[PDB]
From a paper:
Here, we describe the discovery that class I terpene cyclases are bifunctional, in that they catalyze both terpene cyclization and aromatic prenyltransferase reactions in the same active site. Class I terpene cyclases require 3 Mg2+ ions for catalytic function, and these metal ions are coordinated by conserved metal-binding motifs in a unique α-helical protein fold. Interestingly, the diterpene synthase [name] can accept GPP as substrate donor to produce long-chain prenylindoles 11–14. Compounds 11 and 14 were characterized as previously reported (E)-1-(3,7-dimethylocta-2,6-dien-1-yl)-1H-indole and (E)-3-(3,7-dimethylocta-2,6-dien-1-yl)-1H-indole, respectively. This characterization implies that the active site cavity of [name] is sufficiently large to allow the binding of indole as well as C5 DMAPP or C10 GPP to produce prenylindoles.
To determine structure–function relationships in a second terpene cyclase with cryptic aromatic prenyltransferase activity, we determined the X-ray crystal structure of [name] complexed with 3 Mg2+ ions, PPi, and the benzyltriethylammonium cation (BTAC) at 1.46 Å resolution. However, the second aspartate residue in the aspartate-rich motif of [name] is substituted with serine, so this motif appears as D94SVLE98. Even so, metal coordination interactions are as expected: the side chain of D94 coordinates to Mg2+A and Mg2+C with syn–syn bidentate geometry, and Oδ2 of E98 coordinates to Mg2+A and Mg2+C with monodentate bridging geometry. Interestingly, Oδ1 of E98 coordinates to a Na+ ion outside of the enclosed active site cavity. The PPi anion is stabilized by hydrogen bonds with R165, T169, N209, R216, R300, and Y301. The BTAC cation binds in the lower cavity and its positively charged quaternary amino group engages in cation-π interactions with F67, F91, and W294. Additionally, the aromatic ring of BTAC makes a favorable edge-to-face interaction with F67. However, active site closure in [name] also traps two ordered water molecules at the periphery of the lower active site cavity. Additionally, in the upper active site cavity there are two ordered waters (W21 and W22) and an ethylene glycol molecule (monomer A), or five ordered water molecules (W93, W101, W126, W222, and W263) and an ethylene glycol molecule (monomer B). The binding of the bulky BTAC molecule reveals that there is more than enough volume to accommodate the small 5-carbon prenyl group of DMAPP in the active site pocket.
Author numbering: 5 to 308
Amino acid sequence: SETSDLVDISRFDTHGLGANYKLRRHKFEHLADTGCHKARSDWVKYIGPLTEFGGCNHINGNFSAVVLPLCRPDRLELIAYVLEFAFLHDSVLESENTSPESEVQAEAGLRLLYERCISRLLQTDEVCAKKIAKTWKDAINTTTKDKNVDFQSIEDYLEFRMIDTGAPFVEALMLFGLGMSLSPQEDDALGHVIRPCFAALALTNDYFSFDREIEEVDTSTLINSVAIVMRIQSLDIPTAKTIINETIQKYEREFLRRIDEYKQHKGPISNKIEQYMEAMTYQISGNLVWSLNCPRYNPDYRYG
Ligand SMILES: CC[N+](CC)(CC)Cc1ccccc1
Ligand SMILES: [Mg+2]
Ligand SMILES: [Mg+2]
Ligand SMILES: [Mg+2]
Ligand code: NA
């Protein structure tokens, strides 16, 4: 209980999500808010006017402060800056109304801030930074190539969606915040464990960001499991959302199973991998609680 405080997740209406996941909130949240502010200022300086919220949420906690509550305080500002640029660039990648001329116009500014992120990370922790650069580029490239694929099942969708939502990229940021690197063997084995975590994160995002993504569908590619379920099963919004809610609960339980299965088969586990597992579980609770009222998805929490 050094970088963060335990928060009782049962004080929030999580719609049955998050059972058996503990919630923590970083004590240095101000540093995350600072990173978000600076990234937003840099976006206006080099790219254009801001159109939306990113990770800030002063009520339930800045995204980085609740998703990555074990971050070293000296790394939290940079991580929040990187994620804020990712939140804003994400909407650019999904956009459909950008003229070719505007796309060309933004490119060098987006490149400047991308490279600024990578260079600052590399100067801080070269090993950890290389994993962030690799996963970020994979997320950007996969979104760009595959965002209009017509998926015919949630299972197929999720193999794209875990990359499109940047789950491996956030994992690489989390490791950076811990000052942690994994061996090639740990990487191989932990990938199996964290797959259901990535699915739960992506589907939870879909659940809480659906309304906003429909509001934007006139200018933005719709990438959302609730819509897939509506189409495949001919269901309305609340019924499809219930299916997605049940599916999140399935993946949440699966991740807890795989953590304990790893301990039972490949254990006693090191303190390092123990902290890795715990840190991954905090992404689930933090993502969930942040999404309930973040201004990005919830219009009556917006200002400015
Ligand atoms: C909602 C935030 N994010 C990453 C920036 C996409 C914009 C998806 C994500 C959520 C939680 C964990 C990992 C990825
Ligand atoms: Mg996206
Ligand atoms: Mg998006
Ligand atoms: Mg979304
Ligand atoms: Na969209």
